[PDB]
Design a binder for this molecule. Sequence first.
Ligand SMILES: *[Se]c1ccccc1C(=O)Nc1ccccn1
Ligand SMILES: *[Se]c1ccccc1C(=O)Nc1ccccn1
Ligand SMILES: [Cl-]
Ligand SMILES: [Cl-]
Ligand SMILES: [Zn+2]
Ligand SMILES: [Zn+2]
Ligand SMILES: [Zn+2]
Ligand SMILES: [Zn+2]
Lengths: 153, 153
Amino acid sequence: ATKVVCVLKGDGPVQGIINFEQKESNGPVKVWGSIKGLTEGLHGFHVHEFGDNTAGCTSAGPHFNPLSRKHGGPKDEERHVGDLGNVTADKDGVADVSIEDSVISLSGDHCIIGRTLVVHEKADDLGKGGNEESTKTGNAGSRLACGVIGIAQ
Amino acid sequence: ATKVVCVLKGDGPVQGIINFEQKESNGPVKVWGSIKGLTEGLHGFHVHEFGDNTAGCTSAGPHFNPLSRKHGGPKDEERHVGDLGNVTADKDGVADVSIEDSVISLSGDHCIIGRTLVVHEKADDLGKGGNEESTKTGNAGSRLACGVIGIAQ
Ligand SMILES: *[Se]c1ccccc1C(=O)Nc1ccccn1
Ligand SMILES: *[Se]c1ccccc1C(=O)Nc1ccccn1
Ligand SMILES: [Cl-]
Ligand SMILES: [Cl-]
Ligand SMILES: [Zn+2]
Ligand SMILES: [Zn+2]
Ligand SMILES: [Zn+2]
Ligand SMILES: [Zn+2]
C-alpha cells in the first residue's frame, strides 16, 4: 500500500496535514487529516498540476487535468483529476477531512505524487456556477495553503 | 524531458530553489540553483527518504537508500542514492549549486520525485570521518532547510 502525505502552509494561519493511501493501481485513494485556521464552511480542495512552490501557492498552476476536461465535483464524470470538491471547516475553523476518490491515483499518469494540494478561500461551486470560472476553478477563489505531495513511511 | 523543483525552507535563515532536469529516462540528472543564508564553506546536500514535513526536516527520515548501502560521496560505488555530496557557500552565504549525478533519477527505481532535498549545517565527510555517524550521515549535522521534490512546468 502506497502511503503519501502533504503539509499545507501559506501566508496566513491556514495549515494542516493530509494523508493519502492507495491499496492498488486504479483503485480508490483514501484521503484524511485535518486543516485549522479556516473560516467556517466550505473550502475548495484540489490537486494542482505543479509541485512548484517558487512563488507560494500561485506557482502550483491550475487543477491537475491530464484528460483536458472541464471542472466538476468529484462525483461528476466531467471533472479535472485534481477535483476533490470541498472540505468543511467547523465553527472552531477546523476541517476534519475524510474523502475516498477513484480518479486521483498514487501511480500512473493520474499520479498526484510531486503535485500540490491546495485549500481555497471559498466553496467550490462544482462547475455549477454558469460562468467560465465555474468550469475552470469552481469559483473557489485564492489559495490559502498548499503542500507538495510526498512519499510517507 | 522531466523537470522538477524543490523549495528549501526551515526554521532559520536557509532558503533556496533547486531545479532537477533529466533528458533521457535513465540518463544523468542536472541539479542547479541557489541557496542563501548559509555559513561560508561546505554543506551536506542529500535526498532523504520521505517527502514528509509533518515535524519539519526531521520527518524526512534517513538518506534515500533503496540499495541498503552505507553513506559515501557521489563518486563512491558504496553510497546512498541520495548522496549528492556537498555544496559550497561563498563569503556572501550563497551556494550556487550545479551538480550532475547518474545515480539519482526523475523516473524508475532511483526516482527522487516526492522525496525531500535537505541542506545540512556542516560538511559531508563522505563516510571518511572514522565513526558510526560518518557511515550513515557523513556527520553533515543538523537539517537547516528542506523541501519535497515536485513536478515543475
Ligand atoms: Se507515481 C509518479 C509520480 C511522479 C512521476 C511519475 C510517477 C509514476 O509513478 N509514473 C509511472 C510511469 C509509468 C508507470 C507507472 N507510473
Ligand atoms: Se518517478 C516516481 C516517483 C514516485 C513514485 C513512482 C515513480 C515512477 O516514476 N515510477 C515508475 C514506474 C514505472 C515506470 C517508471 N517509473
Ligand atoms: Cl473525518
Ligand atoms: Cl565523491
Ligand atoms: Zn484549486
Ligand atoms: Zn478543477
Ligand atoms: Zn542528510
Ligand atoms: Zn548518505
